């Protein structure tokens, strides 16, 4: 195949909360000043992130949502155990299994 940033759209487009022990993490209610580098700040000490991105929007405004993807299903689970009350920017983050991709 071929890639540079085409897959990073697919990594967040179509993705929703409320899966069940998939592999992807859905993260929501992030503050609107967040960027891709902030994911590895709070997720980096949990385990190995395979990939991670922020959800895009049709009008270009910030969504307040991230997706993350993890090496082992114990590490994906551990994010959803530990982060689902995490205070950041003045917001409390909501965390779930990313249901479709």
Dist. CA 47–CA 70, nearest whole Å: 8
C-beta atoms surrounding 73 within 10 Å: 11
Q: Catalogue all structural domains in the chain, each as residue range(s) with its CATH number.
A: 1-101 (3.30.70.330)
Dist. CA 56–CA 54, nearest whole Å: 6
Dist. CA 75–CA 63, nearest whole Å: 25
DSSP conformational letter for 5: S
| Tokens coding 56 | 């895009």
For residue 87, what are the β-bridge partners? Answer: 92
| Tokens coding 75 | 């590490």
Ramachandran angles phi, psi of 83, nearest 5°: -90, -15
Nearest to residue 42, comparing CAs of 90, 70, 82, 98?
Answer: 82
Dist. CA 12–CA 20, nearest whole Å: 18
Angle at 44 between CA 31 and CA 1, to 5 degrees: 95
Please name the residues in contact with 6: beta carbons below 8 A apart, sequence gap of 6 or more.
none
Residue 63 contacts residue 20 (beta carbons within 8 Å): no
DSSP conformational letter for 27: E
Residue 54 contacts residue 26 (beta carbons within 8 Å): no
Element holding 97 (H helix, E strand): strand 94-97
| Tokens coding 98 | 């990313």
């Amino acid at each position: 195949g071929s890639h540079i940033d085409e897959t990073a759209a697919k990594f967040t487009e179509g993705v929703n909360p409320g899966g069940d022990r998939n592999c992807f993490i859905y993260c929501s209610n992030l503050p609107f000043s967040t960027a891709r580098s902030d994911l590895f700040d709070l997720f980096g000490p949990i385990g190995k992130i395979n990939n991670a991105e922020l959800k895009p929007q049709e009008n270009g405004q910030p969504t307040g949502v991230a997706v993350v993807e993890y090496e082992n299903l114990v590490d994906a689970d551990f994010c959803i155990q530990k982060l689902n009350n995490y205070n950041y920017g003045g917001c409390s983050l909501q965390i779930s299994y990313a249901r479709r991709d």
